[PDB]
Amino acid sequence: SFELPALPFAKDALEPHISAETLDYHHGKHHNTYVVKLNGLIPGTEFEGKTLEEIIKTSTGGVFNNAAQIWNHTFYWNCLAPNAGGQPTGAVAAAIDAAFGSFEEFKAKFTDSAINNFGSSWTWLVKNADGSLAIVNTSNAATPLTDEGVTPLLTVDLWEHAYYIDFRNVRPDYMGAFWSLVNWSFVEENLAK
Amino acid sequence: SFELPALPFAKDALEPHISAETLDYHHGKHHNTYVVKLNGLIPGTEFEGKTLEEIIKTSTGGVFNNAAQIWNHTFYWNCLAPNAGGQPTGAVAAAIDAAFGSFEEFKAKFTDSAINNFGSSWTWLVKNADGSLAIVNTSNAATPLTDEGVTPLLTVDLWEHAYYIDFRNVRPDYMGAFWSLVNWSFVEENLAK
Ligand SMILES: [Fe+3]
Ligand SMILES: [Fe+3]
């Protein structure tokens, strides 16, 4: 009843930054497993007939883990794009200057927060209830979607499966790829939410 | 200042179950990186001069994360060996029969606990203060070393870096490799610590 949504780009569209092989595993195997695990947990529970987001916000344990990781991944994929990356323009550029001083400064901060996020984890740029920007790290399947008022804008997956095939142990090389792939269109869309 | 502990077997000793390449990264890079980071944190702190085990038992945050991972990996390599695996004999066998019913039952319980240990994590067989055996899961850098009177006997590393090169996303396949490599000699030594 939940689907694995198709990626928003072709399997070789992120080359030479993230390989077709990484997509095959990361979307086709990991992301898919969470959909299959969730679909099998919810029959005959209070989460039958709930939306994905409703489940994430009202569950704990295995249901939460699978449901949250489905959302986290689809959001991640939408943060990546061919012919993207580089510097933000528009409303996002100005938000980032207001909050962090410059793109370059925001970039160094986000990057440090990610490289140092311990274990399986996610680093986020979020919009707070009050409207200010923030960089937050979450562990495992946790997500700022469950913090009331907070709007995820951008994320990087730092689980090792996200980069091990292409970058082995080197997160700084993976972050170099991330920045080459950032879909500022999507971040801009989220800013208006 | 700590050093990277030497691997207890040659780089190709665990083939075809765990590759030399995996050992090159997991030992050469990851385990070493924990050493490098610990050494950088401890100068001019109360941890300077302390044994690794004292640091683990008395620290938190980054000092803990790195020190505990050093010990965790050292222990993990000692749990693997060429020409080992299969069924335990003698004292370990009898101890496992009494606590779990049979080796087969303990193996199923330990594999199930491992497969389902969410995120970066470790699965352990431990000896409690009163002499009884138990299976215990820990997340990230945590270790039964910090529970007083508890002696680790056997572990499997379930961080993705440990298996991603050889097994990608499939932990049950890695567990098959684990059981083929368990150094029961080392488990027996641990039963007397
Ligand atoms: Fe992922
Ligand atoms: Fe490891």
Give the nearest partner residue to A160 out of B139, B140, B160, using CB atoms.
B160
Q: Which residues of B touch A33 (CB under 8 A)?
A: 169
Residue B11 burial class via C-beta count within 10 angstroms: exposed 0-12, middle 13-18, buried 19 and up: middle
Cβ contacts of A111 within 8 Å, gap of 6 or more: A172, A175
Residue of chain A minimizing CA distance to B25: A169
Task: Report every protein residue that has its C-beta within 5 angstroms of ion ligand 2.
Answer: B 157, 159, 162
Are B177 and B17 in contact by the 8 Å Cβ rule? The answer is yes
Give the residue on A whose Cα is nearest the Cα of B29.
A169
Distance from CA of A189 to the nearest CA of B (A): 30
Domain positions in chain B are 1-193
Backbone dihedral region of B138: left (phi > 0), alpha (psi from -120 to 50 degrees) or beta? beta
3-state percent breakdown (helix, strand, coil) of chain A, nearest 5: 50, 10, 35
Please check if A30 is assigned to a binding site. no
The b/e string for A6-16 (b: 16+ C-beta within 10 A; e otherwise) is ebebeeebbee
| Helices A171-181 and A103-115, packing angle to 10 deg | 140
Residue B5 carries which side chain, given as an amino acid letter?
A: P
Count of beta carbons in the 10 Å neighbourhood of residue A43: 9
Question: Of A181, A140, A187, which Cα lies nearest the Cα of A159?
Answer: A140
Minimum distance, in Å, between the CA of residue A65 and any CA atom of chain B: 8
Which residues on chain A are in Cβ contact (under 8 Å) with B120? Answer: 119-120, 160
State which approach was used to obtain the coordinates.
X-ray
Burial zone of B90 (CB within 10 Å; 0-12 exposed, 13-18 middle, 19+ buried): exposed
Q: How far apart are CA A119 and CA B140, in angstroms?
A: 6
Number of Cβ atoms within 10 Å of the Cβ of A122:
28
Task: Give the nearest partner residue to B140 out of A65, A118, A164, using CB atoms.
Answer: A118
Nearest to B25 among A65, A118, A168 (CB): A168
